[PDB]
Design a protein around this ligand. Structure first.
Ligand SMILES: OC[C@H]1O[C@H](O[C@H]2[C@H](O)[C@@H](O)[C@H](OCCCCCCC3CCCCC3)O[C@@H]2CO)[C@H](O)[C@@H](O)[C@@H]1O
Ligand SMILES: *C(=O)/C=C\N[C@@H](C(=O)O)[C@](C)(Cn1ccnn1)[SH](=O)=O
Length: 265
């Protein structure tokens, strides 16, 4: 494979869409690769990691418990709720909801959690409170995945998202236990995690949260690194491409391949 930046470019050429990407050292925040890092991209499902970071902040403050069981109704369900639809009789704990939202892509679980943090406005306020002055959530699932051209709603920038994820996972804004919990949820992704490992060379660590939207919107926020260590944060977003899901998946994987083949930078 070619150099990371050259592959990113090749991907835009092949997809006819915009690619946004940041490769950052998790421990220090050193930015290695940055492409359209300050441009807006729909967060799609990747917003759920930030969402649960806000939930954990409430837990740390004593205003929430991961054990707290929430009982909801069928009318509360939205499109795609593989886990939540199975618990209309017994409910789900806040912690279970975060696991379902992040590891299983459960949309209703996400909306329930979003309500606990003050909705889209509440999560955005949380982002502002941790120093992210760019990322914004405006809608709920599943409308937040609309990805209309030129629409600033429900967007982030590669640079903002990488910085925010790093803050949540390592800046000690969240308690030690909470940082560990957020990390384990990403490690436990059941949607793309297993597939990625199946194609990663031996020795490479992966933790992630992926997302998809309309007009070819696609994205992934991940932790990657050799020697089984979460060495770097890698954020990749795609938008405005008419390509098949398969090809969009292939292009993102291709960027990953370039990073893997040219890691020491
Ligand atoms: O010399 C480097 C490596 O080259 C290949 O590894 C290939 C692998 O066979 C392929 O499956 C993967 O595609 C990428 C697989 C992962 C896709 C998702 C990666 C994510 C990570 C998080 C951010 C977005 C990308 O590329 C690598 C690098 O060429 C060899 O098979 C392996 O023996 C060797 O160690
Ligand atoms: C967030 O994850 C956005 C989309 N996820 C879908 C996808 O990746 O294509 C899923 C198939 C879940 N979804 C309507 C989302 N109808 N199913 S999954 O792979 O997360």
């Amino acid at each position: 494979s070619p150099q990371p930046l050259e592959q990113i470019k090749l991907s835009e050429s092949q997809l006819s869409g915009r690619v946004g990407m940041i490769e950052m050292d998790l421990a220090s925040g050193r930015t290695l690769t940055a492409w359209r890092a300050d441009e807006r991209f729909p967060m799609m499902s990747t917003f759920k990691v930030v969402l649960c970071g806000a939930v954990l902040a409430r837990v740390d403050a004593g205003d929430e418990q991961l054990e707290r069981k929430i009982h909801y109704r069928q009318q509360d369900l939205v499109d795609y709720s593989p886990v939540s639809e199975k618990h209309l009789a017994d409910g789900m704990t806040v912690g279970e909801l975060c696991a379902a939202a992040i590891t299983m892509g459960d949309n209703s679980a996400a909306n329930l959690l979003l309500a606990t943090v003050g909705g889209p406005a509440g999560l955005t306020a949380f982002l502002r409170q941790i120093g992210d002055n760019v990322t914004r959530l405006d809608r709920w699932e599943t409308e937040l995945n609309e990805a209309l051209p030129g629409d600033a709603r429900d967007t982030t920038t590669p640079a903002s998202m990488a910085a925010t994820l790093r803050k949540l996972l390592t800046s000690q804004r969240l308690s030690a236990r909470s940082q560990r919990q957020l990390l384990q949820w990403m490690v436990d992704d059941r949607v793309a995690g297993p597939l990625i490992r199946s194609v990663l060379p031996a020795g490479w660590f992966i933790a992630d949260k992926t997302g998809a939207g309309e007009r070819g919107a696609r994205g992934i926020v991940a932790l990657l690194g050799p020697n089984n260590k979460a060495e770097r944060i890698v954020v990749i977003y795609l938008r405005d491409t008419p390509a098949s899901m398969a090809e969009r998946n292939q292009q993102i994987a291709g960027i990953g391949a370039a990073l893997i083949e040219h890691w020491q930078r």
